[PDB]
């Protein structure tokens, strides 16, 4: 009688894992892309500073 309740608990918790895996992976990869863009804009400024700081 409560066996089916436990099955529902397990199944409803399991689908949340799948739903959250995509969210975490997408968020982490978007963070990675943002950091890469930050480094791309940073290195150009670094080279400009190499030429800029008292030549």
């Amino acid at each position: 009688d409560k066996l089916k309740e436990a099955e529902t608990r397990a199944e409803f918790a399991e689908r949340s894992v799948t739903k959250l895996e995509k969210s975490i992976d997408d968020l982490e990869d978007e963070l990675y892309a943002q950091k890469l863009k930050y480094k791309a804009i940073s290195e150009e400024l670094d080279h400009a500073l190499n030429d800029m700081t008292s030549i």
């Binding site: 400009a48 500073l49 800029m52 700081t53 008292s54």
Partner: peptide
């Protein structure tokens, strides 16, 4: 950046 401002 910032040190650019100081140099300028």
């Amino acid at each position: 950046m910032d040190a650019i401002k100081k140099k300028m």
